[PDB]
């Protein structure tokens, strides 16, 4: 955090787009195809995983940006896959759109009129028009009158949405709430449920076979019925690859902007981009930068082991399917196909399954049971050991002291007792202006260990000049130029930040874990109690915190800006937390000795 440098811009909203390989190949900086991560010398070998163009290193520099590792954010690479591979996130949707497609007409199996009306309903569900989304079922009157039906439905939807956009019902970019989302999810679930039943085609009457998967990757193609093959020849069990599936679903999606501009976009699509099957399929694995894959300092990163397995399979296929094609198609004829092409039905398992283990590590291949299977990218996000509930929600912070707590009824109920350990250690950044020159000259003169004092001085240029090694006359000389500013053009509107000690003016936060309710965390004015180590309080607080004194510990958080210390004194101080909002009842009054004192003192026989 800083105050001398204000944050100029402002993040407003977050969109969830998809990288495809056309974006990634223009995007990335280095292709990674080499398992030679480090040589026998130990140096980074280019083309490999710890390449110098994917960021800096310890003694090295970056080949892409050319800066030191303090200033290099790292750049991301792309593994050119041999085969278009399934993205293991998007797999069941691909399984739905493949199992509910017609191989011949390259539309869906279901009839086109129902597809057009689900398109119109899910277009009405983008401007929130649920007033019109059920009026459309009341439009019902062959070969050509159905075209008039679809044209009249389309112009009905057009006039409805144009009327709603003419007045102030809906703004330019739609409206999307919980009611809209509930109706949309229910309709899309009913749509994909109806698509899985109509096996016989409603556009040609032909037959596409049933699919059934084993685990994740294997797709057994079930043999047809006798009458279905008969009906196929009247109108006129097998593993299947991903390139055939890519071609089938691409040919489906190129004919189907209509309904899939509306299933896959719950907003008014401004730029009107298309729906490819390339969103489902992967062509480049984007390898993260250097500073997110560094080893422990020594064990290397286990992400690099799975990237090395993927590149081992990638170099096996660069061996085989490049060095077999240069061979003749006549000499490689009969007995060179029951072994070599029994290996491409075994080397595509290991390019798909290793990307699966790289991302969705549950779907994998078995083994004799060992220590620990390696986590993926999904496994580094999901739980308390993940990322959201471990590094975005629950963080470990600076400027937060901790000790044991102690009784002290000689300090007020809004006061905290600070031992001089923490009175020396924790600092606060006050600026320098002539209303606060006396205490800051005296604080720099007193130095890092004579409380009230100061440990650091931040210049107008942002340099943290520390006062630790400096002598007595190398602190008394600095307070004679804090007052005079510089002739700098950029920083004639700033002042030096003296990082003074915590003193009797400040206020901390206090926090006892676990916090079952919001009265277990308050704000306390500061008293520094000399020559101790424990933090200590009055007894009014010790019913709110559920605190006995058999060794309890509390996290004194010391806020660093003027905003929070202006909010810890008004909105969360102890004087505004008397009544808990559970029942409006008090929880803060005196305890054990004071009650039997008040019984004896207020009794009639005390003269």
């Amino acid at each position: 955090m800083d105050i001398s440098k204000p944050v100029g811009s402002e993040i407003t909203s977050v969109d969830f787009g998809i990288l495809t390989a056309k974006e990634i190949r223009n995007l990335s900086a280095k292709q990674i195809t080499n398992p030679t991560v480090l040589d026998n010398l130990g140096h980074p070998v280019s083309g490999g995983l710890y390449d110098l163009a994917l960021g800096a290193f310890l003694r090295n520099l970056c080949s892409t940006c050319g800066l030191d590792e303090k200033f290099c954010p790292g750049h991301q690479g792309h593994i050119e896959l041999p085969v278009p591979c399934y993205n293991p996130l998007f797999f069941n949707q691909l399984y739905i759109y493949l199992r509910a497609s017609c191989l011949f007409c390259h539309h869906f199996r279901l009839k086109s009129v129902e597809v057009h009306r689900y398109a119109c309903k899910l277009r009405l569900l983008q401007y929130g028009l649920i007033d019109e989304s059920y009026k459309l079922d009341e439009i019902t009157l062959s070969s050509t009158l159905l075209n008039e039906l679809k044209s009249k439905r389309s112009e009905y939807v057009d006039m409805a949405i144009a009327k709603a956009l003419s007045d102030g019902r809906t703004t330019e970019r739609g409206s999307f709430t919980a009611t809209v989302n509930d109706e949309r999810k229910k309709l899309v679930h009913e749509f994909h449920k109806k698509l899985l039943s109509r096996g016989k085609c409603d556009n040609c009457g032909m037959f596409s076979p049933k699919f059934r998967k084993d685990g994740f990757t294997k797709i057994f193609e079930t043999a047809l019925n006798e009458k279905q093959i008969t009906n196929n020849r009247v109108k006129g069990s097998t593993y299947i690859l991903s390139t055939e599936v890519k071609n089938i679903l691409d040919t489906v999606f190129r004919k189907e902007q209509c309904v899939l501009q509306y299933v896959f976009h719950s907003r008014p699509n401004l730029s009107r981009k298309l729906v490819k099957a390339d969103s489902f399929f992967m062509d480049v694995l984007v390898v993260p930068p250097t500073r997110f894959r560094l080893p422990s300092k020594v064990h290397e990163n286990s992400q690099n082991q799975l990237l090395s397995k993927v590149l081992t399979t990638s170099l096996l296929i660069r061996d085989l399917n490049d060095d077999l094609s240069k061979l003749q198609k006549d000499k490689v004829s009969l007995e060179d196909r029951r072994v070599i092409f029994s290996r491409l039905m075994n080397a595509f398992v290991t390019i798909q399954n290793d990307v699966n283990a790289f991302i969705d590590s549950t779907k994998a291949q078995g083994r004799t049971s060992g220590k620990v299977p390696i986590p993926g990218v999904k496994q580094a996000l999901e739980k308390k050991e993940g990322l959201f509930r471990k590094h975005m929600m629950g963080k470990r912070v600076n400027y937060a002291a901790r000790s044991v707590i102690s009784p002290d009824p000689n300090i007020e109920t809004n006061e905290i007792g600070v031992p001089p350990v923490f009175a020396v250690k924790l600092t606060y950044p006050e600026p320098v202006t002539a209303y606060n020159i006396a205490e800051l000259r005296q604080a720099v003169i007193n130095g890092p260990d004579k409380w009230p004092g100061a440990t650091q001085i931040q210049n107008e240029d942002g340099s943290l000049v520390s006062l630790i090694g400096m002598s007595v006359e190398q602190r008394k000389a600095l307070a004679n130029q804090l007052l005079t500013p510089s002739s700098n053009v950029s920083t004639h509107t700033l002042n030096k930040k003296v990082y003074r000690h915590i003193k009797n003016r400040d206020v901390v936060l206090m926090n006892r874990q676990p916090t079952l309710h919001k009265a277990s965390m308050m704000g306390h004015k500061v008293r520094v109690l000399p020559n101790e180590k424990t933090l200590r309080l009055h007894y009014a607080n010790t019913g709110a915190y559920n605190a006995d004194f058999d060794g309890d510990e509390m996290n004194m958080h010391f806020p660093q800006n003027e905003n929070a210390r202006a909010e810890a004194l008004n909105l969360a101080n102890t004087d505004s937390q008397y009544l808990t909002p559970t029942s409006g009842s008090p929880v803060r009054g005196l305890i054990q000795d004071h009650i039997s004192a008040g019984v004896w003192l207020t009794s009639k026989d005390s003269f």
Partner: protein
Amino acid sequence: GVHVSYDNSIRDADGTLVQFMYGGDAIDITKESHMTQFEFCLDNYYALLKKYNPSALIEHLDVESALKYSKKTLKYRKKHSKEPHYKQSVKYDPVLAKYNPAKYLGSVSENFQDKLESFLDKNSKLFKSSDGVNEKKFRALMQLKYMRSLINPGEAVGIIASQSVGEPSTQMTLNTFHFAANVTLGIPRLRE
């Protein structure tokens, strides 16, 4: 993010509306302690007078607009009482439902107003011959006391409503004084 907005409505983050008034009265649960303690607030009257300062709250506060409406609501209320709620049809709105309770002095919830008028019914002798305290002055004090003790626009009442149910569940001892059939009790009931 479920909180209190400037239209005094319990509205979520984007704008999904959960309630129209907080609980029925837009009051704060902390600051509603001695409001229905009328016998207490009759006493200490000058203390609350110098506390509340009504004379500095004249110009920025439309006074009698809700006061004319509220007496008509109450007379139509006592006009039709013995009929049940399905026979008791609705003619016009309650006092808070039409007028903003933090801008119109006298826009008061119905049950608090009923307890106020019943207390001022049954204890006229305490008003008459104790300190000469006027009934109209006491009523026009409690109309300000109901308005100063109102919930703030901005308070995260969703967090508070979560924590005031999650925390007393920790006081539930797992043994059950059940036998006398049976019924699911405690956190096995509150999670269900």
